[PDB]
């Protein structure tokens, strides 16, 4: 089996949909690459790593790349414009039984499902109010 | 109008639902509190701070705690066995229209969505393979 | 394939398998873990390695815990008593044709089967004799 | 009981079979040999002895000839193009009783057994993937 | 698409082709092997990884035997004798599209297809003239 | 013979193919190039020499353009944007026959034939996975 494998980051149905792929596992480090130029292709990274006794920390990052052509002396090249970050670690001990791992998952769907405030707040440009 | 609401962290339909709401907002951090006894309740917060000149920085932890009654001594407390605590940063370009957010947010609910590659590693206690 | 797949550790029949499931894979080992808090988990590593020029070596590991649950500061908490550890190492020339390494592995068996004497006298608290 | 006997390390079915014999019980290590030029042969050995004063171990070694192409009787060399060489220890807490022992033989036997993906891959000459 | 399986490393029309099945995927590299004694195998490896910030590489690697007068099973010293490697490098900005890399295949491709100058050198054990 | 002589590096069907000719053979390294400027050409190069007592190795390097005009100083001059380099080492005993060449170079087109999956993942942006 594997988990390590292609799938979805960007769901607009049907349609343009990001899709992302392994890459390259390094050191325990996964990484997936949307195609086209890496030069413009979101990527997406994990590991795992135990930090304290009780302690396994994954460690999460997103870019997701705002795409366009720079044209520099006559020359098209495609480019990020800029990308944002999404960077993130999540601790969970070692006593979390499976269910419980679960129910974390849960919070983090939780709190960037549409229409739950983050989630609208940074899709706004916005903060809270 | 508000963002700053109560809403479902967790959500196992219509009966378990873990629900948090509007503690504070303390210095451009939101707080959100589940009920009961603070000393078991999860916990949300997030802000947004301008970093560099462009970028635009939200930061949103939370915490999932663990149940349980401590005893010591003949005394019995609700506290938490242990919690655990995701936290990230994201970060936005100023050149960010609004429709590059939503897309932001989908590649983040896109990466945490169930049967995606990280969502079910975190569930399994497992890593990639 | 991918022989990298889930299978049963423990065959108590039916009731109460200890199976075992892929976990990880960072770096080259390959590990699998059973269903449990990772406090409590069965656990299953292997790997191979290109040693001499002339020999590959396996290295595979297993891990049975005793169960239990510890009270620390009057929280009750999943934990091993205690874990038996299970180590070994294998070497195979290079010129080992896929037949050579069948006798291995059934030898490995015949080592190990419920009745001759090694599986005997471990079972046993015993010493061969 | 008395364990020290024959058996039959490689089940070829009922027939090419190879049993071990008893060879030498020198030190309290218990050597089982099939019949052959040393050079040749098949050889288990196995010793207990107590180490931490919380743990005994185990002490397995087997060594199986590359058959293939062999030449009963050479002088093949060198040695070690011709044999594999496995290695264990097994380390089981003072606490275990001889139920949990069982246990641990089961899950070494479940580690190994044909069709699992250790036992797989070895006799494939892989890896894991 | 999954791209690890079992091809045709050498087409020798219909029969007596070469099958490489996948053998290992220990840290991102993909390995495939012949169905050999691995003194004996055919194997290829490749892997990606990004190297200057302008840059990836796959690096792959062909190992083939000497099959002339070649001994099946055999201990066959010294070992460099019987095989020879290939080795490749293939650097690819990060700009390049797809069609970028299509189009670098089929350079490949072309290098190296029969009866081209390089191709034929090679079998004929040769230098350009 | 002199296999030294023209080819087509890239196939594409009959419309521009990117074909390739003998333009130097100065100390030894066999170069061919495609007929653009000497800013924009493809271009190939070869050699042999003679390694350890028992190999040699041929040396292939080919480099792809990715084509367009700067202007530098307001001048347009053809250019590349960048190249993409290809880069390989083969090493043959010196007891290869010609049929152990030609299985050589076989194998190495099973690698790179279009669908077999490494040449698969290159033009797809892509790891094997």
Redesign the interface.
């Given at each position: 089996?594997?988990?390590?494998?292609?799938?979805?980051?960007?769901?607009?149905g049907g349609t343009g949909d990001?899709k992302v792929?392994?890459?390259?596992?390094?050191?325990?480090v996964?990484?997936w690459?949307s195609?086209?130029?890496?030069?413009q292709?979101?990527k997406?990274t994990?590991?795992?790593r135990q930090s304290s006794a009780?302690n396994?920390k994954?460690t999460?990052k997103?870019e997701?790349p705002?795409v366009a052509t720079q044209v520099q002396?006559?020359?098209e090249?495609?480019?990020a414009?800029?990308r944002?970050?999404?960077?993130?670690?999540?601790?969970?001990?070692?006593?979390?039984?499976?269910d419980?791992?679960?129910?974390?998952?849960?919070?983090?769907?939780?709190?960037?499902?549409?229409g739950?405030?983050?989630?609208?707040?940074?899709?706004?440009?916005?903060?809270?109010?």
């Open positions: 089996a594997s988990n390590f494998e292609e799938f979805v980051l960007v769901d607009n990001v792929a392994p890459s390259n596992f390094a050191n325990g996964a990484e690459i195609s086209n130029s890496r030069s292709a979101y997406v994990c590991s795992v009780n396994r994954y999460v997103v997701v705002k002396g006559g020359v090249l495609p480019v414009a800029w944002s970050y999404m960077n993130m670690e999540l601790t969970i001990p070692v006593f979390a039984t499976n419980d791992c679960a129910l974390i998952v849960k919070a983090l769907q939780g709190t960037f499902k549409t739950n405030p983050i989630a609208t707040a940074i899709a706004a440009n916005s903060g809270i109010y």
